[PDB]
Design a protein around this ligand. Structure first.
Ligand SMILES: [Mg+2]
Ligand SMILES: [Mg+2]
Ligand SMILES: [Mg+2]
Ligand SMILES: [Mg+2]
Ligand SMILES: [Mg+2]
Ligand SMILES: [Mg+2]
Ligand SMILES: [Mg+2]
Ligand SMILES: [Mg+2]
Ligand SMILES: [Mg+2]
Ligand SMILES: [Mg+2]
Ligand SMILES: [Mg+2]
Ligand SMILES: [Mg+2]
Ligand SMILES: [Mg+2]
Ligand SMILES: [Mg+2]
Ligand SMILES: [Mg+2]
Ligand SMILES: [Mg+2]
Ligand SMILES: [Mg+2]
Ligand SMILES: [Mg+2]
Ligand SMILES: [Mg+2]
Ligand SMILES: [Mg+2]
Ligand SMILES: [Mg+2]
Ligand SMILES: [Mg+2]
Ligand SMILES: [Mg+2]
Ligand SMILES: [Mg+2]
Ligand SMILES: [Mg+2]
Ligand SMILES: [Mg+2]
Ligand SMILES: [Mg+2]
Ligand SMILES: [Mg+2]
Ligand SMILES: [Mg+2]
Ligand SMILES: [Mg+2]
Ligand SMILES: [Mg+2]
Ligand SMILES: [Mg+2]
Ligand SMILES: [Mg+2]
Ligand SMILES: [Mg+2]
Ligand SMILES: [Mg+2]
Ligand SMILES: [Mg+2]
Ligand SMILES: [Mg+2]
Ligand SMILES: [Mg+2]
Ligand SMILES: [Mg+2]
Ligand SMILES: [Mg+2]
Ligand SMILES: [Mg+2]
Ligand SMILES: [Zn+2]
Ligand SMILES: [Zn+2]
Lengths: 91, 62, 50, 149, 69, 114
RNA sequence: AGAUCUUGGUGGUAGUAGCAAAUAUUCAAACGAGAACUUUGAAGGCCGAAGUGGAGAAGGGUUCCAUGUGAACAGCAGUUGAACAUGGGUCAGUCGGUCCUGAGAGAUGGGCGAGCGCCGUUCCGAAGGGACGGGCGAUGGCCUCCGUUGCCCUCGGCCGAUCGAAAGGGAGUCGGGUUCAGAUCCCCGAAUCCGGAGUGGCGGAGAUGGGCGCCGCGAGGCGUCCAGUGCGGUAACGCGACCGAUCCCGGAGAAGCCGGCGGGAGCCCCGGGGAGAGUUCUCUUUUCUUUGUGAAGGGCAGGGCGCCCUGGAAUGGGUUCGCCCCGAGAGAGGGGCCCGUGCCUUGGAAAGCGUCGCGGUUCCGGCGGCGUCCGGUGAGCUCUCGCUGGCCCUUGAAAAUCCGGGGGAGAGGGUGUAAAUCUCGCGCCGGGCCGUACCCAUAUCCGCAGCAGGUCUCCAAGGUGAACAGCCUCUGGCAUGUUGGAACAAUGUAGGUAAGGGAAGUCGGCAAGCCGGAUCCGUAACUUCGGGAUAAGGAUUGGCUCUAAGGGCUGGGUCGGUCGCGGCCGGCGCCUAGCAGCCGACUUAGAACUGGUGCGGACCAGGGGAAUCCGACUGUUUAAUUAAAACAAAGCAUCGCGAAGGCCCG
RNA sequence: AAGCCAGAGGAAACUCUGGUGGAGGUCCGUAGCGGUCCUGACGUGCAAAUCGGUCGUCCGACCUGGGUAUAGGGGCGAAAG
């Protein structure tokens, strides 16, 4: 059965720290403890080891990513921008 | 002597219980025994050809 | 303690050796003026400075 | 410990004797184990490559930027941060860059820097929520945390 | 301690230079010959007393043949 | 029941003070101070997490008194690297050398075309 | 004569206060001048395994152990003593130190400083004193040949002395006996680690085979030539060795906390068989005790594997308590490896133990008989091994030390009963120095003391019970806490009860009292939606006799068509709605009967509700009068600083 | 608490139910640590700060040994001079 109406993962924090703070940390905790699909082996076994460090249990590949997400929007846009600068340099 | 009476059910009652029902007989241990007993039965039925893979697997999830 | 160094053991040995009463014949010497050993030490009364 | 940015062990070949040299680069975001990184003037523009700011294009961004030519990285080292290459002038061999503080700075064109943003993402997004978590954070850093007014 | 299985092996390890003595132990169901070498006490177990007696007669001379009973 | 005492002067439950229970021929229970649990070598590849097979798992100073065979495997890199990563390295070396030959042929024919 | 004078002595108080925290003693006897206190015996009790038990670390330092004394001391006493006196007692390659580094400490170079010095610890140093390698010589000498010595060539970053842990890292000792006091140290017996062996200690390995000319009945031999730094398995990997330097790479050492499972052991529990005790007024095939196999080897269980081979899977399957896994190779079949602390075996029964006897050597490791057996259970407790998870803006040492691999500079012999070499088997020699007794606490330490305080750990039985709770008990220990006797006034301290009323007492429900466990119901406002919540409120609870439900092991054949009263294939049959037998934990539910309505019968064990103020919460705080609303806190906001810098020390 | 399994209701979207799971500066409560009240005892004390009952917390900003570093106008202070 459904156990909580809205708190979900931050039900561990009880009544403490304030509703807005629990709501803010809920999304980060979900993304931080979620298992992503490894882009090297295709398995959903890439999970966070430490802050910024993402390890795949299957292919044993370690990636430097974001603090809570596997990769950050700034990193993705920057990688695309660097790829465009390199293709302009070659062209 | 009192152990022999208790195996027959004496001195158990309601006024002889101090621990919680889960403290006297944990639900997890009851569930753990239940899963092992029923999974053993389903396995033995599969290699005795009483059920196939598909009946076993659906019943395993049940 | 049971664990002790050689220097500590030797210091304790000297203290133990020198903590004993005077010989009886000392009181018979000429111009003795010594009645007992005033430097006696008991382990429970006075502790060694060490 | 005490640092929000991951560190990368990178193993090079010694060019003058038979040996392996292990470095401790600050991890640019997106690099992975088993990946080849390249350092030098002729390095190509890839995330994790190290090459002088003078050879980089006019809009690239960099990770572990040298404050002076010759030393190791000094600028934009904290997690999630980056510097931007604004402009060059080959005469006087100078390069203007923008620092994470938003301030512009003129440096030598020979200063090396890692291409990309440093890993460790938005570490400051998450509320600490607990005096205990603040305690554990600063215990790995230094004795500064319980702050009496 | 080491255990010997065959008779000739026990004979050759009993005729060694470092064999101090041989102790013969008569149990209810077997006979044990224990030669005290430099490093190990080599024990050979014989289940039948005719072979036990044959070995006892075949023991090398000049060596202690101490019996535990 | 019979209760036990330490047989040495180290009285704390430290990592070097680990004991097991033994029954003597004199019918008493005693502590026997156990050695630490040894570990098999880890593969030199650094990528796969299993420990090597065919190598005895002992404390490092015990390896001095072991036979050579009990410390390695009859294979290239054996006792230091795993079979899977040795196969991968053989294939990788051969294929990269072949690619070097390919690039050499391509540039030679490019120079011939000119 | 004074100075709350200095030093010393002495009164009244005064035979007074007092010798009242932790339940408790009694009888008989011995010794002795003398017994409430010593010792022995018999009772009655207590600690009750988170001990008043058994052992350590720090600290103490001889308090340890015998004998003797009865001055003083042990706030009564003492025939006793941690007192006094006289003697005695601590045995190590394998238990520690010693060695390593840790946080850190600290020389030298350099810098500073009037100066003793202090700054600094790789920084402003010509910081390697070493090496198998090659050459030049001395042939030093058993000058064949191999070992030394000097120099040169080549190589050589711990890039920093040194110190720093009796709880970190750190090879390798166990069983039995023994003293008045010592033992993992002595003795007995079994091992093991490290180092050494030049003249080489012995074996085994390397390694001893093919071709050709022939001799020769064949077999087998002579000569010549050619190999020979091992071998097996598809593989994982295996076998007893398995040439090899400088150099390089890697591993081990070397890692947090928490959860859930699984294996093994020790203990606990149950059913028998012995041996010895206990009860026997009646009953009790009964109750209690006891009923071993070390290290190190070999073998076999068992556990684990992110190891291999065949093969190719959707009608997806396998599978856990949970998970989780799979075309990057599931399920299935066959293998390999690791651990093996479990069992068997060598050790090993000869020892030990329990009983029953017999000798003497004032105080025999005496002698002898018998036995040391067969089982069953488990969410049990404690260790340990393993698997799989969770948590972190926390990621949970280093270094000695040991090993494997890559590479192939070299070295080894001309086919000999051979060489270099050997991490294989056995043999020979050695392991120095210091610590080691005892206490480890309501009496061996600190607190002026034999001080209700303080002081770091290990082991951990039965009943009840959720329980390492409380209460009772066994092993072990003790004598009631620095005195006893007789009475039972006041006042007290600690603990109870009290008709009727129920806070009228008081600044104030201070203190006390009520409630309390578990099961079944039932739970409001408000809310940050998580909570409130054991809200509140209600019923039940014993004993006895049953009933029902909840498991695990085996065996599921139609038979001589025949002979290895038993089988190899099949004419010869249909449990397939599942049976037959055997074995075994507690738990839950229902019912009847029954007691003077009493049943969480002791123990354990929330009074509740409605609001107001403050602080969000958890945390911290004035050791010795203030625990709070104070501090902290997350959150919010501001400020400085791009290193020739901000803030700060000097 | 998340995660997971099954069933049911739904035209769908989805919802509901029962298990499993075992989070938390989570609650009751030992040991430990602390020290609220009795303004109890004691107050020439057992004690130059102790004792009894009652209490706060008890997986964490937790308790604690040893080794270290900071020294007087200095240290150190979740702050009470
Ligand atoms: Mg003292
Ligand atoms: Mg503040
Ligand atoms: Mg055994
Ligand atoms: Mg006068
Ligand atoms: Mg009086
Ligand atoms: Mg009195
Ligand atoms: Mg009692
Ligand atoms: Mg004790
Ligand atoms: Mg004594
Ligand atoms: Mg007296
Ligand atoms: Mg004395
Ligand atoms: Mg140097
Ligand atoms: Mg040292
Ligand atoms: Mg140690
Ligand atoms: Mg002793
Ligand atoms: Mg045995
Ligand atoms: Mg398979
Ligand atoms: Mg016997
Ligand atoms: Mg001792
Ligand atoms: Mg005391
Ligand atoms: Mg003093
Ligand atoms: Mg009393
Ligand atoms: Mg008394
Ligand atoms: Mg006392
Ligand atoms: Mg009344
Ligand atoms: Mg009344
Ligand atoms: Mg009133
Ligand atoms: Mg009034
Ligand atoms: Mg009250
Ligand atoms: Mg309320
Ligand atoms: Mg009833
Ligand atoms: Mg508060
Ligand atoms: Mg507020
Ligand atoms: Mg406090
Ligand atoms: Mg105070
Ligand atoms: Mg107070
Ligand atoms: Mg606010
Ligand atoms: Mg809590
Ligand atoms: Mg609490
Ligand atoms: Mg008072
Ligand atoms: Mg003030
Ligand atoms: Zn992957
Ligand atoms: Zn590998």
């Amino acid at each position: 059965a459904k156990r909580t109406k809205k708190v979900g993962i931050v039900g561990k924090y009880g009544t403490r720290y304030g509703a807005s703070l629990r709501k803010m940390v809920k999304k980060i905790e979900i993304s931080q403890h979620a298992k992503y699909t490894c882009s090297f082996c295709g398995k959903t076994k890439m999970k966070r080891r430490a802050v910024g460090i993402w390890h795949c249990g299957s292919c044993m590949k370690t990636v430097a990513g974001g603090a809570w997400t596997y990769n950050t929007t700034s990193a993705v846009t920057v990688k695309s921008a660097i790829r465009r600068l390199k293709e302009l340099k070659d062209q | 002597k009192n152990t022999l009476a208790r195996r027959k059910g004496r001195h158990m009652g309601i006024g002889k219980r101090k621990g919680t029902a889960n403290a006297r007989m944990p639900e997890k241990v009851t569930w753990m025994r239940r899963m092992r007993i029923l999974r053993r039965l389903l396995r033995r039925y599969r290699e005795s050809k009483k059920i196939d893979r598909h009946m076993y697997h659906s019943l395993y999830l049940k | 303690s049971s664990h002790k160094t050689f220097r500590i053991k030797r210091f304790l040995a000297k203290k133990q050796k020198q903590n004993r009463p005077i010989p009886q014949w000392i009181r018979m010497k000429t111009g003795n003026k010594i009645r007992y050993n005033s430097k006696r030490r008991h382990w429970r009364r006075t502790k060694l400075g060490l | 410990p005490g640092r929000g940015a991951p560190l990368a062990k990178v193993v090079f070949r010694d060019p003058y004797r038979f040996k392996k040299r292990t470095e401790l680069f600050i991890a640019a975001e997106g690099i992975h184990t088993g990946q080849f990184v390249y350092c030098g003037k002729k390095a190509q523009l890839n995330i994790g490559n190290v090459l002088p700011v003078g050879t980089m294009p006019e809009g690239t961004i960099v990770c572990c930027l040298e404050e002076k030519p010759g030393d190791r990285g000094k600028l934009a080292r904290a997690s999630g941060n980056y510097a931007t290459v604004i402009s060059h002038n080959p005469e006087t061999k100078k390069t203007r860059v923008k620092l994470p503080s938003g301030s512009k700075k003129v440096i030598s064109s020979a200063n090396r820097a890692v291409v990309g943003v440093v890993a460790g993402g938005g570490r400051i997004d998450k509320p600490i929520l607990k005096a205990g978590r603040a305690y554990h954070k600063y215990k790995a850093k230094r004795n500064c945390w319980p702050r009496v007014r | 301690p080491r255990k010997i299985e065959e008779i000739k092996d026990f004979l050759l390890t009993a005729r060694r230079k470092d064999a101090k003595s041989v102790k013969i132990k008569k149990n209810k169901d077997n006979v044990k010959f224990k030669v005290r070498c430099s490093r190990y006490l080599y024990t050979l177990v014989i289940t039948d007393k005719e072979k036990a007696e044959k070995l006892k007669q075949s023991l090398p001379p000049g060596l202690a043949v101490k019996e535990l009973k | 029941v019979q209760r036990l005492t330490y047989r040495r002067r180290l009285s704390y439950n430290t990592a070097s003070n680990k004991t097991r229970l033994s029954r003597t021929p004199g019918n008493r229970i005693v502590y026997l101070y156990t050695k630490k649990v040894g570990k098999a070598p880890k593969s030199a590849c650094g990528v796969c997490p299993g420990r090597l097979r065919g190598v005895r798992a002992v404390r490092p100073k015990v390896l001095m008194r072991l036979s050579k065979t009990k410390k390695h495997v009859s294979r290239a890199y054996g006792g230091s690297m795993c079979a899977k990563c040795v196969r991968d390295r053989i294939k990788r070396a051969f294929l990269i050398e072949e690619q070097k030959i390919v690039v050499k042929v391509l540039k030679a024919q490019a120079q011939s075309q000119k």
